[PDB]
Design an enzyme around this catalytic site. Structure first.
Site, PDB file in Angstrom:
ATOM      1  N   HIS B 460       0.954  -1.339  -0.046  1.00 15.25           N
ATOM      2  CA  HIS B 460       0.255   0.194  -0.081  1.00 15.25           C
ATOM      3  C   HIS B 460       0.913   1.199   0.035  1.00 15.25           C
ATOM      4  O   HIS B 460       0.773   2.188  -0.827  1.00 15.25           O
ATOM      5  CB  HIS B 460      -1.158  -0.061   1.122  1.00 15.25           C
ATOM      6  CG  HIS B 460      -1.755   1.077   1.137  1.00 15.25           C
ATOM      7  ND1 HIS B 460      -3.153   1.246   0.829  1.00 15.25           N
ATOM      8  CD2 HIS B 460      -1.681   2.470   1.955  1.00 15.25           C
ATOM      9  CE1 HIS B 460      -3.685   2.090   1.116  1.00 15.25           C
ATOM     10  NE2 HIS B 460      -2.766   3.085   1.726  1.00 15.25           N
ATOM     11  N   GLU B 461       1.689   1.374   0.896  1.00 14.73           N
ATOM     12  CA  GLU B 461       2.511   2.378   1.058  1.00 14.73           C
ATOM     13  C   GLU B 461       3.682   2.768   0.040  1.00 14.73           C
ATOM     14  O   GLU B 461       3.721   3.760  -0.526  1.00 14.73           O
ATOM     15  CB  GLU B 461       3.489   2.361   2.315  1.00 14.73           C
ATOM     16  CG  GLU B 461       2.288   2.585   3.450  1.00 14.73           C
ATOM     17  CD  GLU B 461       1.555   3.687   3.562  1.00 14.73           C
ATOM     18  OE1 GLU B 461       1.915   4.701   3.097  1.00 14.73           O
ATOM     19  OE2 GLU B 461       0.423   3.779   3.853  1.00 14.73           O
ATOM     20  N   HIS B 464       1.958   4.421  -2.701  1.00 19.10           N
ATOM     21  CA  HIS B 464       2.077   5.982  -2.847  1.00 19.10           C
ATOM     22  C   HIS B 464       3.481   6.570  -3.344  1.00 19.10           C
ATOM     23  O   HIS B 464       3.828   7.508  -4.026  1.00 19.10           O
ATOM     24  CB  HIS B 464       2.083   6.517  -1.184  1.00 19.10           C
ATOM     25  CG  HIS B 464       0.577   6.304  -0.895  1.00 19.10           C
ATOM     26  ND1 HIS B 464      -0.431   7.134  -1.402  1.00 19.10           N
ATOM     27  CD2 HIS B 464       0.027   5.994   0.294  1.00 19.10           C
ATOM     28  CE1 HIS B 464      -1.725   6.994  -0.871  1.00 19.10           C
ATOM     29  NE2 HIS B 464      -1.338   6.428   0.053  1.00 19.10           N
ATOM     30  N   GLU B 489      -5.707   7.775  -2.575  1.00 21.49           N
ATOM     31  CA  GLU B 489      -5.508   6.312  -2.156  1.00 21.49           C
ATOM     32  C   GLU B 489      -5.812   5.427  -3.279  1.00 21.49           C
ATOM     33  O   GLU B 489      -5.612   4.256  -3.198  1.00 21.49           O
ATOM     34  CB  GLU B 489      -6.620   5.854  -1.193  1.00 21.49           C
ATOM     35  CG  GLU B 489      -6.496   6.798   0.183  1.00 21.49           C
ATOM     36  CD  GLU B 489      -4.960   6.795   0.931  1.00 21.49           C
ATOM     37  OE1 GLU B 489      -4.805   5.094   0.662  1.00 21.49           O
ATOM     38  OE2 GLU B 489      -4.431   7.582   1.373  1.00 21.49           O
ATOM     39  N   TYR B 599     -11.463   6.605   1.121  1.00 16.57           N
ATOM     40  CA  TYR B 599     -10.677   5.313   0.932  1.00 16.57           C
ATOM     41  C   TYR B 599     -11.485   4.554   0.380  1.00 16.57           C
ATOM     42  O   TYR B 599     -11.088   3.875  -0.647  1.00 16.57           O
ATOM     43  CB  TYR B 599     -10.271   5.038   2.553  1.00 16.57           C
ATOM     44  CG  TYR B 599      -9.288   5.422   3.283  1.00 16.57           C
ATOM     45  CD1 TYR B 599      -7.837   5.058   2.975  1.00 16.57           C
ATOM     46  CD2 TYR B 599      -9.615   6.545   4.064  1.00 16.57           C
ATOM     47  CE1 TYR B 599      -6.825   5.722   3.462  1.00 16.57           C
ATOM     48  CE2 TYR B 599      -8.442   7.252   4.620  1.00 16.57           C
ATOM     49  CZ  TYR B 599      -7.067   6.889   4.520  1.00 16.57           C
ATOM     50  OH  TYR B 599      -6.092   7.572   5.163  1.00 16.57           O
TER      51      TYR B 599
HETATM   52 ZN    ZN Z   1      -2.495   5.398   1.790  1.00 17.89          ZN
END
Ligand code: ZN
Lengths: 7, 665
Positions: B460-461, B464, B489, B599
């Protein structure tokens, strides 16, 4: 500052 | 050079408290000099060069220098460095409001848009003008001078309240003391890592690497209850006072600007556009998930009744807040044979990192190289250079800050440190990002072992990070992840799907002891387990989204009571009397105010792209990956979120994949 879900 | 790395990362991480203070002053003086020069221009004299370019230039200079000052509060191990950084963040946030409220700048940007040949400037420059004007109106610069001064005063107060809100949570150090017997069913590798007390008991903090293991695995109901009571009363009194000031201030400035509520105010800057679309979105999803929540709550209650019978405990006949994670974990073990503590033996952190990096080198057409003797803010941080695989263009660098430590940001996040935008001399600035998470430390003579949910967070990170590094724009303000809040997101949740694919999971795993792979049987079960507890897990996110909307729609409501209302109406698990979860809800003060729905809103888009494009063509398909990089990541905030989705999908996105992905079709 882009963070995930709060559980 | 776009093909070198040396000298392009200008960030320094050895600043003393005094240097942080001094650099803050110098940045404010020098930056205000540019704004004063622009404001001194006659309105008839403004050009692209002396107004738009001068502002774009000082914006990239300011944001990079601001990074070295406001980032140490999150990662530095020196408490005085963290304090100087927080103090700098307060000053620079006040300065940001000051400069954004300058009417002389607003009038010159408006005149520039009205008099320049908009067809002959770059599209992103047209966007810069219209976004700057929109921001000016959202600061009241078209309204009378008295209302501008009023909005400015409330903005400054709101800024100090938000910084204090997150600071209170970040520096909280509450802990509880439990004996070994009170920690029953918790594994030895967890217990042996705890601080011991004089009475041969153990200290358990409220941080995530302590709280959730206890809530998921401790078989002593009283231990779970006391941890939940403490976790959901962190900063209760001081952050309630903050919310009772902050929320009314948001309503008052929103009403001064002409908006009915603060939620209406922020929704205008999001792809969802309106609060009525958010409400319809959350309420419809809640209705579809209702029978799932009922079946999961019925199975949990039967498990609790059996365990209370088989062990001799008392049975209150309800699912308490401190029962939820424990029996959701039981549901996963019983229905999908998943023991997270056995599974983590196959995800040593070095194997996970290697597999993670290789996956996105191949998918996105990149190459990652770790830098040696890197200048970092902590000894455990590593640095990587990102190049385009085909051309060698040095796109950016990222830091990996993976392990817990005192004073470190205790959740998970990706920080944009340098924008991948153009510089005053026309060259391109190298993007820089930082992945900041709190993964399990190496214990018991083993490497760090990641649970599957930590692998998911890792992906997930990193999504980003990839968004920050692949984004290339003309202007800093559109760089990196500066997209709509309910769209940011999308790239992070997008990559999560690669941890639910069998072949991908094989590349992410290797037993720490004998090097063997995960058995095919357990691999299939792990992938099939994606929907376990999905009813209550998603209903909980809806509770948080509904609470966030409500607190920013009716500013008269008691926050704790409105949280309790949605818990019993939507989740079916009552909030513990005496707790105040909103007082711990850091998203309310960290840029997700009125926007927490984003989200779930983003996940609709990511599921649509993954199902319609990656599952169809193969999830490691390099040309689908390159199209994803070019059309979703590379524009940064220079395009509207819905335009990038349309560019990628060649159509409007819809909910079909998301519903299928949840078992609702
Ligand atoms: Zn996030």
């Amino acid at each position: 500052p882009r963070r995930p879900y709060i559980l | 050079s776009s093909y070198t790395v040396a000298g392009r990362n200008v960030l320094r991480w050895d600043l003393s408290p005094e240097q942080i203070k001094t650099r803050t002053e110098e940045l404010i003086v020098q930056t205000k000099q540019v704004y004063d020069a622009v404001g001194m221009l006659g309105i008839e004299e403004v050009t692209y060069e002396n107004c738009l370019q001068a502002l774009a230039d000082v914006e990239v200079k300011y944001i990079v220098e601001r990074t070295m000052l406001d980032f140490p509060q999150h990662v530095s191990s020196d408490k005085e460095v963290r304090a100087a950084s927080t103090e700098a963040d307060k000053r620079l946030s006040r300065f940001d409001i000051e400069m954004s409220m300058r009417g002389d700048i607003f009038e010159r940007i408006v005149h520039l848009q009205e008099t320049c040949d908009l067809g002959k400037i770059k599209p992103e420059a047209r966007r810069y003008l219209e976004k700057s004007i929109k921001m000016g109106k959202r600061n009241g610069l078209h309204l009378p001078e008295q209302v501008q001064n009023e909005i400015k005063s409330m903005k400054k107060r709101m800024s100090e309240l938000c910084i204090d809100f997150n600071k209170n949570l970040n520096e909280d150090d509450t802990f509880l003391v439990f004996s070994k017997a009170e920690l029953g069913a918790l594994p030895d590798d967890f217990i042996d890592s705890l601080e011991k007390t004089d009475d041969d008991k153990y200290k358990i903090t409220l941080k995530y690497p302590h709280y959730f293991p206890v809530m998921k695995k401790c078989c002593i109901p009283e231990t779970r209850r006391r941890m939940e009571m403490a976790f959901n009363t962190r900063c209760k009194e001081e952050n309630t006072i903050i919310l009772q000031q902050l929320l009314p201030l948001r309503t008052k400035v929103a009403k001064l600007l002409g908006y009915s509520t603060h939620a209406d105010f922020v929704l205008e800057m999001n792809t969802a556009k309106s609060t009525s679309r958010v409400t319809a979105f959350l309420d419809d999803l809640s209705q579809k998930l209702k029978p799932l929540g009922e079946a999961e709550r019925e199975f949990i209650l039967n498990l609790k009744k059996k365990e209370c019978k088989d062990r001799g405990f008392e049975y209150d006949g309800k699912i308490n807040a401190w029962d939820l994670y424990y029996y959701m974990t039981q549901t996963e073990e019983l229905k999908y044979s998943i023991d997270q503590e056995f599974l983590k033996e196959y995800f040593p952190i070095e194997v996970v990192t290697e597999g993670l990096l290789n996956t996105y080198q191949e998918l996105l057409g990149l190459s990652f190289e770790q830098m040696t003797d890197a200048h970092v803010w902590n000894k455990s941080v590593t640095l990587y250079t990102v190049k385009d695989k085909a051309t060698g263009e040095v796109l950016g660098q990222f830091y990996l800050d993976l392990y817990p430590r005192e004073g470190k940001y205790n959740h998970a996040a990706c920080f944009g440190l340098q924008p991948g935008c153009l510089l005053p001399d026309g060259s391109r600035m190298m993007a820089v990002a930082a992945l900041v998470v709190n993964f399990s430390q190496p214990v018991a003579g083993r490497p760090s072992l990641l649970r599957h949910d930590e692998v998911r967070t890792y992906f997930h990170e990193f999504g980003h990070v990839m968004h920050q590094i692949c984004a290339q724009t003309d202007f800093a303000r559109f760089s990196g992840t500066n997209v709509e809040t309910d769209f940011v997101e999308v790239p992070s949740q997008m990559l999560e799907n690669w941890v639910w694919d069998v072949d991908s999971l094989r590349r992410l795993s290797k037993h720490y002891k004998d090097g063997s792979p995960i058995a095919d049987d357990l691999l299939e079960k792990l992938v099939a387990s994606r929907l376990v507890n999905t009813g209550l897990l998603t209903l909980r996110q809806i509770v948080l989204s509904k609470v966030d909307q409500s607190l920013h729609t009716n500013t008269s409501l008691d926050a704790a009571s409105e949280y309790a209302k949605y818990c019993s109406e939507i989740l079916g698990v009552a909030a513990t009397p005496g707790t105040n979860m909103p007082a711990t809800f850091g998203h309310l003060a960290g840029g997700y105010d009125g926007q927490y729905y984003g989200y779930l809103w983003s996940e609709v888009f990511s599921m649509d792209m993954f199902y319609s494009c990656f599952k169809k063509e193969g999830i490691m398909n390099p040309e689908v990956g390159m199209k994803y990089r070019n059309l979703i990541l590379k524009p940064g905030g220079s395009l509207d979120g819905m335009d990038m989705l349309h560019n990628f999908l060649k159509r409007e996105p819809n909910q079909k994949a998301f519903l299928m992905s949840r078992g609702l079709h």
